[PDB]
Subunit: 305 residues, 4 copies
């Protein structure tokens, strides 16, 4: 049936490959710090309208003007929220991967360099934090270029991972064509990395490593209609996810992503969720807390194409 169908619904099937994580880890835990603030929709950036998504104003209108509430909500993340998250990771000696938006990174260079100073990975989260669904591949390719160049120029580091989020039908192709990415995270389809065959211009295909991310174990759900009400909701969700995976780790260890946003989890009332979750996983043996790039390198070494 439908031999040419361009989606893999089967994956590993019933019995996934043995991850063989370092330290016989039962689960690999991968915290993602999104840094988008300064790169979002804003007429100041030449966008037609103000930002609507992932704010304290759930269901916000877009205006062909500056929306000040929305701007200072985003400014919280870069002014305050980010530092609160970074302090907590530093105090615990734990790494994370920053999904850095290029324009955001240029607007706050001292913070961007603090990320590198703290030893965190920076992956490229696009030049702009905007919806790419309808953008032509020529323009999207231009932004990819601007995004990587911005990050490298400011931090001295060349990202090795890509994640747009609100991507287009072309983004996987554009990542493969640009090349040099050890992983692409625009995928919610599994609990382990795997390889995708990405069709490129000409119709032929090229292997790309996918390191799947998450939209459910993600503080973005504080700003969506179905959405954690309190720190303890997000904490219990993470805790439960971790417990399920950790118990599976005797048979077939998996990975877990945790999605974080400066302007969201950085709020003091939500931040307790991170503290509680870290305390939880610290009680467990055989947990690898890894940079995303470390999981990609591990996969490429142990589970080559």
């Amino acid at each position: 049936f439908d031999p040419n169908y361009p989606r893999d619904l089967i994956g590993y099937g019933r019995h996934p490959v043995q991850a063989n994580w370092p330290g016989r880890a039962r689960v690999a835990v991968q915290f993602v710090l999104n840094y988008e603030e300064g790169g979002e929709n804003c007429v100041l950036h030449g966008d037609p309208a103000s930002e609507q998504f992932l704010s304290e104003i759930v269901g916000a209108a877009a205006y062909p003007a500056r929306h000040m509430s929305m701007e200072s909500i985003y400014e919280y993340g870069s002014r305050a929220g980010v530092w609160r998250i970074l302090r907590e990771f530093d105090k615990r000696g734990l790494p994370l991967t920053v999904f850095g938006v290029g324009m955001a990174i240029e607007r706050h260079p001292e913070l961007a360099r603090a990320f590198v100073e703290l030893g965190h990975e920076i992956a490229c989260h696009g030049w702009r934090w905007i919806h790419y669904q309808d953008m032509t591949p020529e323009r999207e390719a231009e932004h990819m270029r601007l995004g990587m160049e911005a990050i490298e120029r400011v931090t001295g580091v060349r990202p090795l991972g890509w994640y747009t989020g609100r991507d287009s039908p072309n983004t996987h192709r554009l990542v493969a064509e640009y090349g040099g990415f050890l992983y692409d995270s625009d995928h919610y389809g599994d609990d382990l990395p795997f390889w995708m065959d990405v069709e490129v211009s000409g119709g032929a295909s090229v292997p790309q490593l996918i390191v799947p991310y998450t939209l459910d174990a993600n503080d973005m759900r504080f700003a969506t209609p179905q959405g954690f009400n309190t720190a303890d909701h997000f904490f219990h969700y993470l805790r439960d996810a971790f417990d399920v995976l950790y118990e599976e780790g005797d048979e077939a260890p998996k990975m877990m992503s945790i999605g974080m946003h400066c302007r969201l989890l950085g709020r003091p009332g939500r931040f307790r969720a991170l503290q509680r979750f870290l305390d939880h996983i610290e009680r467990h043996d055989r947990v690898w807390v890894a940079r995303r790039v470390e999981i990609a390198r591990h996969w490429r070494e142990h589970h080559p194409y």
Copy 2:
């Protein structure tokens, strides 16, 4: 008043019939595993646009294009979530009924045969998982035929139950005209099976056994605006539902359905809900955990038309 009114508001009235479940069960528990992944709206399938319903992106837009995030969200169900659910049932030696979308069944034939190998019932959930409200009866009838043929072709099993979900005003009639269905579950109107007089072409009626399903005791509510935040919310709902029914079962035993979706309850952070509920009901005497078709056979034997 309104003698010809074609809805039964009254049902069993204040005193329902005695279920007389096997083993003098106080309640019959019927777990449903929806399998829709591969059958949803997608331009690959010839649909106008991408899927909007029952994902991690609540309030998602439809695009006349492939929506990648939506596709990998669905792929999660077929790749990973399904197996997590099937493992739990298997470990506990419990049966369930699959509401299998024909197209999805065809796209993952090894999994479809695994359902049968594991002893689960497969019912027909339509050829496509698309809204049928506005579809003409000619077109909807063709889909029913395609759905039934697909499932039997792949699994060797002819379904005996029908459930569309987002059905049309004609769907009951189409089930009746097709024939051979021991039960139809397009109904949220009671806590016990019952007989519906279904008007067929010509305007005469034919009895159809209804086994009612559920939109509240259903993990779909993780993806709706009013919607469980954590595993514990879904667990407590099911627990409470069961508890109320179990207490009623000293006087008038009822059934309870539980709706599950691979891409939703199969996520690790939701999955704890199922484990906690199974643990809860395991502690109770006089629980019949049944395949949907076993409940319909029971009713036909003990409560004939």
Copy 3:
């Protein structure tokens, strides 16, 4: 400022009147059982489209046809949910008031008679359960006549209370012009009854006794965007509201309404909320559990215009 302004923002001000409830009650608790099922938007009733409001499908579209899922969701209330609620009150020997839709009462006359048999009050909740905001007063007045007459024909009771819910700017005047009501509950503005001056024809005002109702302490919030997720959310809300009122009762006793819908609270998973709340208030001295009409008669005797 604005001498002529026709809203009373002030009410009792800082020190309300002493309620002086029977038995020196600290709080008067008034349960409402809305009975709308069979009176909702349906093309079978000559309405343009299918019901959208207060269902298991939050955000439902309206169709110019029968919406089967919506119909059976409503049928659950008349078929099953109503009897579960009536059993609980009967078992505890407690009264409630029914807010009865005339058409729904006419479609289930045996149940309507059962409400009277069990000693509950029946108040008029309109001829139809539909939005009245945009209706002309000529048309609205006709519906009021039809609702009052339906209820009286079926049950033999002449309602002494009125509640539309989704009312119009004319409804209070219509209730005043109709005459013979002891109270109107189309108001969410206080914790005590109070008297409203309603303008009728001929430049005259007439007093109307308001007994305020509730949109927060109401199971309707299970079907609204901001929405109790579990039974315990609704119980805890009721519990808390009661506790706050009860503590105020040593200085200035108030009343509390609880809103219930057969198709919502009647579901097993929600129903625990009622049981738990009833157990809670049973532990408390000096609680008057009252028919609405009994509160109105008390007010008219002890706190006349």
Copy 4:
């Protein structure tokens, strides 16, 4: 990059200034009682349509007519909810700042005077409680004048604080140009006050003290789609927010705002969240429960414009 960019994404950076609150407070807690009821959208007030926002009917339509449910939900706040909140603060001997809507204040003058007699601050929350995003700055400046004048005529107090809420791209400039304000709270960008350079006419900027407010530690979230289901949700969110800040207060004390609405938190079912939170903060040493004007005066004295 983008030298001219008119947003400060950086603020204090990684080490904020030492707040040095009175009493060596670890955290300054600032309760805000919004008073909008009687000032909201209503055809009686000359608006096109009925109110849709911050009610028990979430997702309400607007009607070019009176919407009675919406009117009585709003009247609960002025008839009942307000006195319940005020009783609680009175019993505990605690102050708050009222974000008072000019029109609402004029329609309940005894209550407005009660705010003053109870020792609370009144800040100006606009003449009208409506969306100002699309309003022209001539129109918006006229409302500012009317709001300030109404408050002052009714209560005798000249507000020293401004909060619109649903503001416009011009409101900071309108506040700067009006003069006499000690602070503006139309900002959600930090855990401490700070100074903003506000552009006025003639190519001149003037400094404006911001005392940031909150949209998350706010009972408005009982009336929004992502939104506390019970009293305990709001209490636990406030508790957690306070605990986090209180733990930071050993290195760098910050402030916390708590947003309250008469028609929301004043409901018995919600009100327990306030009581439980106050009980939590009562058990903690070194908490300054402040009027918003007191925090502004503090910053001006200890952290002058830099």
